[PDB]
Structure formats: structure tokens, C-alpha cells
Amino acid sequence: KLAYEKSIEMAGNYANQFDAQMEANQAIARTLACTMAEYGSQDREEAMSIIKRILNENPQLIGVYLGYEPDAFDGRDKNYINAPGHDSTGRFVPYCNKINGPVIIEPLVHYDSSDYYQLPKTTGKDTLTEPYFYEGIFMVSYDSPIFKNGEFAGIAGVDVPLEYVDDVASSIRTFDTGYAFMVSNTGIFLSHPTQKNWIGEKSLSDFDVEEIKNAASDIREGIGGHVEIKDPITGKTVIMFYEPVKTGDFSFVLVVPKEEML
């Protein structure tokens, strides 16, 4: 009980440690969105220089981007069809990034259907995607709607790689063999000390174990808690403590062998 409470606080502590940098990342996209909502100068090259500077000043990001509705940045998509950083629409959709090493700007893709654009568009709200792999890079995307004259004009977003999560989480130790990992709001592993292959690929809700499914429900709803999980075949019990990460309701999880705690 002294053991559980201390573990509850430690999980909460780490959850908020990860949360802090996420709030900062979210604030970058949001402030870029506020700024572009007031931006009347219509200078595409200048807007691409602004996103490239924000990228280069934030080493924890891998992409900074804007994507606009037809003609909503400067009324002139027809003049930018297939220009550098554009596609065949001429919409202003520059994705400034260093996914492949060097910084380049190429057009966003799937903005007519993918959540990073469509959720801001239909909800009017800031959003954080679930984690995914793109071109070999494990990441999430934070996006904020740009409102011009009270109408949705497009989004400002930042892509955030998550490799550092496993670097940090998988070296956390508690008691004798207690360990830690982070998951996303739908329970997708962002880290794991031994199963690198679960990262980005498996979810808590995939485990055929009542207690783990129950943890994943709470996690989905932003709820902290703990469960006791007994392995009938090894006889070993662990306690799995999970505490919400407030930005996106991800979750920081500590797993502790019950005997070590008493």
C-alpha cells in the first residue's frame, strides 16, 4: 500500500514529464496556426521560410507544415500547379521536413481524407494523431486549425518523432525488475524494454486478458489506475500501474512484480 501509492505517484510523475514536451509541441503548431490566421501578406516563399525556421529551431520535430483549402491562402493556386513544394492542385500544402535526412519541402498528401487535416476541419479542434510509421520514422502529428474570418482555411502542424520515448522509457527501473512503457490513447505501444517489435504495432487491447483490456479502456478515456494480472501458467503476478498523459490522453505504464513490492 505504501508500495502502491509510491508507484502511483511515480507513474503520474513520469506521465507529466512526457506531457510537458507534448504541451510545448502542441503550442508550436497552435501558435503557427494563430499567426497564419492573421497573415495577409500572401507570400508563399515567406511562409515556407517561417516553417523551415521553426523546424530548424526545434530539433525534436521532424516536419512543420501548413495545408490550406482551395485558394484559401492567397487566392492563387492556379499559379502554383506543380511548382516546387506543390502538387497538381497548386494548393498551399508545404510539408517542410527532414524525414530522409536533409531538410526539404514537398507537398502534403491525403489532406482530403486523412485525420491530421480532416479532424481539424470537421471538429474545429486541435488534434494529435495516433502514432504511426512514415518512411521508416515512428511518429505522431499535432495539428491546429487555421480560422480566417471565422471560417476554416486550413491547418498548421508539426510531426514529432517518438524514438526518444523508447530510449527514455525502456531504461526506467523500479524495485528489482519493475519496468515501464508508454502507450497511445488507443493503447498502441510507444516503447517496450524487450519487445521492440510491439512498438507501433501491438496494442494493449490486443491481449486476451481481461485485466489488460480493462486497463486499455481506462487509458482510452484518460483514466489512471492499476490492475493485478496473474499469469496462471507461470504463477507470477504483476501490478500494472497506468497514469494519463494529459495531451492526447496517452498513458505511462509501470509494471511491477507484486512480490517485489511487498
mmCIF file of C-alpha atoms in Angstrom:
data_model
loop_
_atom_site.group_PDB
_atom_site.id
_atom_site.type_symbol
_atom_site.label_atom_id
_atom_site.label_comp_id
_atom_site.label_asym_id
_atom_site.label_seq_id
_atom_site.Cartn_x
_atom_site.Cartn_y
_atom_site.Cartn_z
ATOM 1 C CA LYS A 1 0.000 0.000 0.000
ATOM 2 C CA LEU A 2 2.926 2.311 0.754
ATOM 3 C CA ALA A 3 4.328 0.409 -2.216
ATOM 4 C CA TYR A 4 1.334 1.026 -4.465
ATOM 5 C CA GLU A 5 0.935 4.720 -3.611
ATOM 6 C CA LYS A 6 4.566 5.387 -4.290
ATOM 7 C CA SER A 7 4.263 3.606 -7.657
ATOM 8 C CA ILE A 8 1.032 5.554 -8.455
ATOM 9 C CA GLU A 9 2.950 8.836 -7.900
ATOM 10 C CA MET A 10 5.979 7.749 -9.806
ATOM 11 C CA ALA A 11 3.806 6.767 -12.810
ATOM 12 C CA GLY A 12 1.972 10.121 -12.539
ATOM 13 C CA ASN A 13 5.393 11.917 -12.255
ATOM 14 C CA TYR A 14 6.714 10.294 -15.491
ATOM 15 C CA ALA A 15 3.405 10.790 -17.264
ATOM 16 C CA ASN A 16 3.673 14.532 -16.619
ATOM 17 C CA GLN A 17 7.372 14.567 -17.562
ATOM 18 C CA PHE A 18 6.379 13.243 -21.005
ATOM 19 C CA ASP A 19 3.354 15.527 -21.045
ATOM 20 C CA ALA A 20 5.461 18.714 -20.644
ATOM 21 C CA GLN A 21 7.246 18.338 -24.014
ATOM 22 C CA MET A 22 4.000 17.382 -25.700
ATOM 23 C CA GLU A 23 2.299 20.597 -24.459
ATOM 24 C CA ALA A 24 5.225 22.566 -25.904
ATOM 25 C CA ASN A 25 4.920 20.772 -29.247
ATOM 26 C CA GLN A 26 1.179 21.357 -29.305
ATOM 27 C CA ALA A 27 1.830 25.104 -28.534
ATOM 28 C CA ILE A 28 4.245 25.343 -31.535
ATOM 29 C CA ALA A 29 1.556 24.184 -34.004
ATOM 30 C CA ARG A 30 -1.071 26.298 -32.320
ATOM 31 C CA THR A 31 0.936 29.488 -32.322
ATOM 32 C CA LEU A 32 1.827 28.896 -36.027
ATOM 33 C CA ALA A 33 -1.896 28.468 -36.684
ATOM 34 C CA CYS A 34 -2.898 31.748 -34.827
ATOM 35 C CA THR A 35 -0.156 33.574 -36.744
ATOM 36 C CA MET A 36 -1.227 32.255 -40.169
ATOM 37 C CA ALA A 37 -4.856 33.081 -39.398
ATOM 38 C CA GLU A 38 -3.708 36.780 -39.342
ATOM 39 C CA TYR A 39 -1.230 36.502 -42.139
ATOM 40 C CA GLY A 40 -2.492 38.694 -45.031
ATOM 41 C CA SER A 41 0.773 39.166 -46.906
ATOM 42 C CA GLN A 42 0.179 36.044 -49.079
ATOM 43 C CA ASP A 43 3.858 35.330 -49.602
ATOM 44 C CA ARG A 44 4.254 31.567 -50.097
ATOM 45 C CA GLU A 45 8.014 31.702 -50.112
ATOM 46 C CA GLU A 46 7.966 33.668 -46.834
ATOM 47 C CA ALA A 47 5.527 31.126 -45.226
ATOM 48 C CA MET A 48 7.806 28.299 -46.352
ATOM 49 C CA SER A 49 10.770 30.099 -44.817
ATOM 50 C CA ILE A 50 8.826 30.512 -41.497
ATOM 51 C CA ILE A 51 8.020 26.740 -41.305
ATOM 52 C CA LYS A 52 11.572 25.815 -42.227
ATOM 53 C CA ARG A 53 12.957 28.101 -39.425
ATOM 54 C CA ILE A 54 10.531 26.616 -36.843
ATOM 55 C CA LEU A 55 11.726 23.123 -37.940
ATOM 56 C CA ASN A 56 15.407 24.021 -37.710
ATOM 57 C CA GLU A 57 14.947 25.699 -34.271
ATOM 58 C CA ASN A 58 13.174 22.623 -32.860
ATOM 59 C CA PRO A 59 15.373 19.543 -33.130
ATOM 60 C CA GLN A 60 12.580 17.416 -31.512
ATOM 61 C CA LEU A 61 10.443 17.934 -34.617
ATOM 62 C CA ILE A 62 10.895 16.266 -37.993
ATOM 63 C CA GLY A 63 8.300 18.180 -40.007
ATOM 64 C CA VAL A 64 6.466 21.547 -39.813
ATOM 65 C CA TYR A 65 3.734 22.168 -42.362
ATOM 66 C CA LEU A 66 0.724 24.191 -43.464
ATOM 67 C CA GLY A 67 -2.086 22.888 -45.636
ATOM 68 C CA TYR A 68 -4.812 25.183 -46.975
ATOM 69 C CA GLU A 69 -8.263 24.900 -48.560
ATOM 70 C CA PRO A 70 -8.533 25.610 -52.308
ATOM 71 C CA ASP A 71 -7.479 29.228 -52.826
ATOM 72 C CA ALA A 72 -7.596 29.964 -49.084
ATOM 73 C CA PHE A 73 -4.003 31.169 -48.609
ATOM 74 C CA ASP A 74 -3.710 33.768 -51.367
ATOM 75 C CA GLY A 75 -6.446 33.222 -53.973
ATOM 76 C CA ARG A 76 -3.753 31.979 -56.438
ATOM 77 C CA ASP A 77 -3.472 28.143 -56.500
ATOM 78 C CA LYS A 78 -3.675 28.285 -60.303
ATOM 79 C CA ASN A 79 -0.273 29.977 -60.329
ATOM 80 C CA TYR A 80 1.445 27.203 -58.279
ATOM 81 C CA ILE A 81 0.302 23.980 -60.038
ATOM 82 C CA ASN A 82 3.329 21.634 -59.848
ATOM 83 C CA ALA A 83 5.687 24.326 -58.516
ATOM 84 C CA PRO A 84 8.387 23.409 -56.098
ATOM 85 C CA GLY A 85 6.735 22.134 -52.813
ATOM 86 C CA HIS A 86 3.318 21.857 -54.580
ATOM 87 C CA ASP A 87 1.291 19.152 -56.348
ATOM 88 C CA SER A 88 -1.043 19.288 -59.272
ATOM 89 C CA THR A 89 -3.695 21.259 -57.338
ATOM 90 C CA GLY A 90 -1.497 24.301 -56.594
ATOM 91 C CA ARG A 91 -2.986 24.383 -53.095
ATOM 92 C CA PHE A 92 -0.541 25.690 -50.463
ATOM 93 C CA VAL A 93 0.331 22.468 -48.698
ATOM 94 C CA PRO A 94 4.098 22.638 -47.970
ATOM 95 C CA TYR A 95 5.434 19.910 -45.755
ATOM 96 C CA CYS A 96 8.810 21.032 -44.632
ATOM 97 C CA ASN A 97 10.686 18.036 -43.221
ATOM 98 C CA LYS A 98 13.854 16.099 -42.725
ATOM 99 C CA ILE A 99 12.277 12.570 -42.820
ATOM 100 C CA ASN A 100 15.065 11.421 -45.137
ATOM 101 C CA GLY A 101 17.966 13.383 -43.647
ATOM 102 C CA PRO A 102 18.235 16.754 -45.421
ATOM 103 C CA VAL A 103 15.533 19.432 -44.955
ATOM 104 C CA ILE A 104 13.253 19.638 -47.959
ATOM 105 C CA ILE A 105 9.731 20.909 -48.705
ATOM 106 C CA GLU A 106 7.364 18.693 -50.709
ATOM 107 C CA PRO A 107 3.570 18.718 -50.782
ATOM 108 C CA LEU A 108 1.451 17.098 -48.113
ATOM 109 C CA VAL A 109 -0.571 14.138 -49.288
ATOM 110 C CA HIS A 110 -4.005 12.771 -48.333
ATOM 111 C CA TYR A 111 -5.154 16.086 -46.893
ATOM 112 C CA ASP A 112 -8.609 15.422 -48.461
ATOM 113 C CA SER A 113 -9.023 12.250 -46.382
ATOM 114 C CA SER A 114 -6.521 11.874 -43.601
ATOM 115 C CA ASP A 115 -7.230 12.762 -39.928
ATOM 116 C CA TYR A 116 -4.370 15.161 -39.494
ATOM 117 C CA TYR A 117 -6.242 17.580 -41.787
ATOM 118 C CA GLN A 118 -9.823 16.309 -41.724
ATOM 119 C CA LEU A 119 -10.297 16.196 -37.901
ATOM 120 C CA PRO A 120 -9.290 19.843 -37.523
ATOM 121 C CA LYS A 121 -11.512 20.615 -40.445
ATOM 122 C CA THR A 122 -14.665 18.902 -39.192
ATOM 123 C CA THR A 123 -14.172 19.272 -35.480
ATOM 124 C CA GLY A 124 -12.727 22.780 -35.414
ATOM 125 C CA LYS A 125 -10.390 21.429 -32.748
ATOM 126 C CA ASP A 126 -6.568 20.886 -32.228
ATOM 127 C CA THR A 127 -5.607 17.276 -32.714
ATOM 128 C CA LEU A 128 -2.931 14.657 -32.060
ATOM 129 C CA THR A 129 -2.903 11.633 -34.221
ATOM 130 C CA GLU A 130 -2.349 8.119 -33.003
ATOM 131 C CA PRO A 131 1.357 7.017 -33.587
ATOM 132 C CA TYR A 132 2.390 5.703 -36.964
ATOM 133 C CA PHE A 133 5.364 4.843 -39.152
ATOM 134 C CA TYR A 134 6.034 7.000 -42.203
ATOM 135 C CA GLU A 135 9.104 6.402 -44.410
ATOM 136 C CA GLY A 136 10.684 4.423 -41.609
ATOM 137 C CA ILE A 137 10.088 7.074 -38.945
ATOM 138 C CA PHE A 138 7.850 6.334 -35.910
ATOM 139 C CA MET A 139 5.949 9.492 -35.020
ATOM 140 C CA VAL A 140 2.829 11.417 -34.223
ATOM 141 C CA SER A 141 1.419 14.552 -35.700
ATOM 142 C CA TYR A 142 -0.080 17.612 -33.876
ATOM 143 C CA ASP A 143 -2.376 19.769 -35.944
ATOM 144 C CA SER A 144 -4.337 23.052 -35.331
ATOM 145 C CA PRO A 145 -6.950 24.622 -37.488
ATOM 146 C CA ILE A 146 -6.346 27.988 -39.112
ATOM 147 C CA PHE A 147 -9.568 30.110 -38.966
ATOM 148 C CA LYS A 148 -9.789 33.146 -41.283
ATOM 149 C CA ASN A 149 -12.848 35.345 -40.831
ATOM 150 C CA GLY A 150 -14.316 32.716 -38.598
ATOM 151 C CA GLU A 151 -14.078 30.111 -41.362
ATOM 152 C CA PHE A 152 -11.707 27.081 -41.515
ATOM 153 C CA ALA A 153 -8.935 27.951 -44.030
ATOM 154 C CA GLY A 154 -6.508 25.043 -43.335
ATOM 155 C CA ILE A 155 -4.090 23.637 -40.738
ATOM 156 C CA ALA A 156 -0.678 24.207 -39.187
ATOM 157 C CA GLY A 157 1.022 21.031 -37.918
ATOM 158 C CA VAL A 158 4.240 19.522 -36.576
ATOM 159 C CA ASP A 159 5.433 15.954 -36.932
ATOM 160 C CA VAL A 160 7.149 14.622 -33.825
ATOM 161 C CA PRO A 161 9.319 11.515 -33.875
ATOM 162 C CA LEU A 162 8.878 9.136 -30.928
ATOM 163 C CA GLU A 163 12.069 7.151 -30.864
ATOM 164 C CA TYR A 164 13.170 9.090 -27.828
ATOM 165 C CA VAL A 165 10.202 7.622 -25.905
ATOM 166 C CA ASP A 166 11.685 4.102 -26.017
ATOM 167 C CA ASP A 167 15.168 5.496 -25.273
ATOM 168 C CA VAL A 168 13.818 7.079 -22.149
ATOM 169 C CA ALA A 169 11.078 4.736 -21.028
ATOM 170 C CA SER A 170 12.910 1.442 -21.525
ATOM 171 C CA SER A 171 15.707 2.439 -19.121
ATOM 172 C CA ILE A 172 13.371 3.187 -16.214
ATOM 173 C CA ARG A 173 13.731 0.576 -13.431
ATOM 174 C CA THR A 174 11.862 0.180 -10.238
ATOM 175 C CA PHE A 175 12.171 -2.321 -7.313
ATOM 176 C CA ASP A 176 14.236 -5.232 -8.615
ATOM 177 C CA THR A 177 12.926 -5.911 -12.138
ATOM 178 C CA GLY A 178 9.995 -3.403 -12.405
ATOM 179 C CA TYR A 179 9.910 -1.583 -15.761
ATOM 180 C CA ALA A 180 7.979 0.959 -17.804
ATOM 181 C CA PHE A 181 6.493 1.662 -21.126
ATOM 182 C CA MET A 182 4.269 4.343 -22.737
ATOM 183 C CA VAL A 183 1.161 3.745 -24.874
ATOM 184 C CA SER A 184 -1.056 5.935 -27.030
ATOM 185 C CA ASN A 185 -4.624 6.742 -26.366
ATOM 186 C CA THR A 186 -5.800 3.565 -28.162
ATOM 187 C CA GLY A 187 -3.194 1.550 -26.204
ATOM 188 C CA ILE A 188 -0.578 1.248 -29.037
ATOM 189 C CA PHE A 189 2.918 0.645 -27.603
ATOM 190 C CA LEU A 190 5.207 3.674 -27.994
ATOM 191 C CA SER A 191 8.057 1.776 -26.258
ATOM 192 C CA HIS A 192 8.892 -1.585 -24.650
ATOM 193 C CA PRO A 193 12.069 -2.687 -22.965
ATOM 194 C CA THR A 194 12.287 -6.065 -24.751
ATOM 195 C CA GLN A 195 9.691 -6.339 -27.421
ATOM 196 C CA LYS A 196 10.909 -3.751 -29.941
ATOM 197 C CA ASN A 197 8.609 -5.432 -32.365
ATOM 198 C CA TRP A 198 5.449 -4.394 -30.401
ATOM 199 C CA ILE A 199 6.304 -0.671 -30.839
ATOM 200 C CA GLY A 200 3.890 0.972 -33.135
ATOM 201 C CA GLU A 201 2.411 -2.469 -33.969
ATOM 202 C CA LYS A 202 0.661 -4.011 -30.992
ATOM 203 C CA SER A 203 -1.912 -2.583 -28.625
ATOM 204 C CA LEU A 204 -2.913 -3.407 -25.003
ATOM 205 C CA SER A 205 -6.328 -4.209 -26.328
ATOM 206 C CA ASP A 206 -4.869 -6.997 -28.436
ATOM 207 C CA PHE A 207 -4.034 -9.129 -25.296
ATOM 208 C CA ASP A 208 -6.563 -11.793 -24.455
ATOM 209 C CA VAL A 209 -6.551 -10.925 -20.759
ATOM 210 C CA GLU A 210 -9.456 -9.247 -19.013
ATOM 211 C CA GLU A 211 -7.351 -7.020 -16.764
ATOM 212 C CA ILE A 212 -5.318 -5.646 -19.759
ATOM 213 C CA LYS A 213 -8.460 -4.900 -21.769
ATOM 214 C CA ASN A 214 -9.774 -3.078 -18.655
ATOM 215 C CA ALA A 215 -6.563 -1.012 -18.418
ATOM 216 C CA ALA A 216 -6.835 -0.164 -22.133
ATOM 217 C CA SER A 217 -10.497 1.080 -21.615
ATOM 218 C CA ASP A 218 -9.446 3.369 -18.858
ATOM 219 C CA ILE A 219 -6.470 4.572 -20.953
ATOM 220 C CA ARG A 220 -8.692 5.325 -23.896
ATOM 221 C CA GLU A 221 -10.818 7.561 -21.521
ATOM 222 C CA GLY A 222 -7.835 9.305 -19.940
ATOM 223 C CA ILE A 223 -8.199 7.428 -16.572
ATOM 224 C CA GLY A 224 -5.275 6.415 -14.340
ATOM 225 C CA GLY A 225 -5.418 3.202 -12.332
ATOM 226 C CA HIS A 226 -3.859 -0.145 -11.674
ATOM 227 C CA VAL A 227 -4.645 -3.758 -12.284
ATOM 228 C CA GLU A 228 -3.337 -7.034 -10.929
ATOM 229 C CA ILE A 229 -2.518 -9.569 -13.637
ATOM 230 C CA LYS A 230 -1.778 -13.215 -12.625
ATOM 231 C CA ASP A 231 -0.164 -15.482 -15.086
ATOM 232 C CA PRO A 232 -1.906 -18.918 -14.448
ATOM 233 C CA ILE A 233 0.823 -20.770 -16.275
ATOM 234 C CA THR A 234 3.911 -19.238 -14.538
ATOM 235 C CA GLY A 235 2.060 -18.356 -11.293
ATOM 236 C CA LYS A 236 3.593 -14.858 -11.463
ATOM 237 C CA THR A 237 1.614 -11.738 -10.589
ATOM 238 C CA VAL A 238 2.488 -8.200 -11.709
ATOM 239 C CA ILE A 239 0.754 -4.948 -10.893
ATOM 240 C CA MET A 240 0.342 -2.683 -13.961
ATOM 241 C CA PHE A 241 0.033 1.000 -12.960
ATOM 242 C CA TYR A 242 -1.047 3.476 -15.704
ATOM 243 C CA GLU A 243 -1.413 7.289 -15.400
ATOM 244 C CA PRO A 244 -2.687 9.557 -18.118
ATOM 245 C CA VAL A 245 -0.519 11.823 -20.206
ATOM 246 C CA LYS A 246 -2.824 14.806 -20.447
ATOM 247 C CA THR A 247 -2.044 15.861 -24.110
ATOM 248 C CA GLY A 248 -3.886 13.290 -26.150
ATOM 249 C CA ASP A 249 -4.598 11.062 -23.129
ATOM 250 C CA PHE A 250 -1.660 8.768 -23.884
ATOM 251 C CA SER A 251 -0.531 6.714 -20.845
ATOM 252 C CA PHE A 252 2.614 5.998 -18.934
ATOM 253 C CA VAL A 253 2.624 2.478 -17.541
ATOM 254 C CA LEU A 254 4.740 0.860 -14.830
ATOM 255 C CA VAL A 255 4.739 -2.895 -14.472
ATOM 256 C CA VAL A 256 5.862 -4.202 -11.058
ATOM 257 C CA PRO A 257 6.228 -7.816 -9.819
ATOM 258 C CA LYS A 258 3.805 -7.969 -6.922
ATOM 259 C CA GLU A 259 6.238 -9.846 -4.647
ATOM 260 C CA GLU A 260 8.956 -7.252 -5.127
ATOM 261 C CA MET A 261 6.552 -4.649 -3.855
ATOM 262 C CA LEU A 262 5.908 -6.470 -0.640
#
